[PDB]
Design a protein. Structure first.
Lengths: 188, 188
């Protein structure tokens, strides 16, 4: 009866956009797997923080399905996500089974690369807007967090807490999200 | 002419309170050393995120002095910091040379353990107030960020961005902090 989250961690990922959702989701009792795109080896993030994943993506793929798949941002991290066939397969499968897909900052550009959720309203970091909107396959929003159907997007490192709590609310409900939020000393 | 920051990373540290200042400080061009209290081995943080430090504290101690020493929170992390003689030596030396000391959430309780900055106004996580105030050696504040002399404290994971930008402002000035803040998409 425990919900499960998959966080895909690639070289160049924004480490704040990775750690905040992982931390907050585990505070919510969600079982989170931080999966390395390239294997189990440590991952050097965009600002040189080195994180050890819980598993390779290859192994985590076999222990699905996941209630949410989370794509952190970081320009180079998102490019690596966009180029990976393994990510394409995971996202398409998640879209087919109507599971939640969450991406932040530059992360949503991987959805375009893999043709995921076309027709949805999405947000990105302002600097990633042009890339996300190439072709007009989505409708753009400037909301700090945006949720359209099963696609949940957010804008940047400074929206990471709101992004993570939106995932908790979607998975575990509004009361758990509120309980988890209080000890964090968030402003609003 | 490059400013230097030492971040002391112990088992049980709050990983969000570690990664956010490290990331933000490096965005500000500060040279940050994430030093493992127990050595160079990977550190399991409070919510099971595993971070690889840049160096052992023993080695980083020899490459001082640092313009700021940063103590993340996390209840068990702060206890480990409070019990370490190596941390005591580093903090006393930093206090003597009038360098900045920054601590967040439960981190400030390590200052009391090592008799650092008595008489200063400080804040902590609400749950750490009683521990910090044992003996009445500080004056308590409920401000999200508090700076008194060379002691800079903050309340919790949700104040981590404000905490980190206060360090940048103290070290690099108000304009650099403002430049670093804009791409983050912080609310206020």
């Amino acid at each position: 009866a425990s919900k499960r989250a998959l966080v895909i961690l690639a070289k160049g990922a924004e480490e704040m956009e990775t750690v905040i959702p992982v931390d907050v989701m585990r505070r919510a009792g969600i079982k989170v797997t931080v999966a390395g795109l390239a294997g189990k080896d440590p991952v050097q993030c965009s600002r040189d923080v080195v994180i050890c994943p819980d598993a390779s993506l290859e192994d985590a793929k076999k222990e699905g399905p996941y209630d949410v798949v989370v794509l952190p941002g970081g320009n180079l991290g998102a490019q690596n996500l966009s180029e990976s066939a393994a990510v394409k397969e995971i996202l398409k499968e998640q879209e087919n089974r109507k599971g939640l897909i969450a991406a932040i900052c530059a992360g949503p550009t991987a959805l375009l690369a893999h043709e995921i959720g076309f027709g949805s309203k999405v947000t990105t970091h302002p600097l990633a807007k042009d890339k996300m909107m190439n072709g007009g396959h989505y409708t753009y929003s400037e909301n700090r967090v945006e949720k359209d159907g099963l696609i949940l997007t957010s804008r940047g490192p400074g929206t990471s807490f709101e992004f993570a709590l939106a995932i908790v609310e979607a998975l575990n409900g509004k009361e758990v999200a509120a309980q988890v939020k209080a000890p964090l000393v968030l402003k609003d």
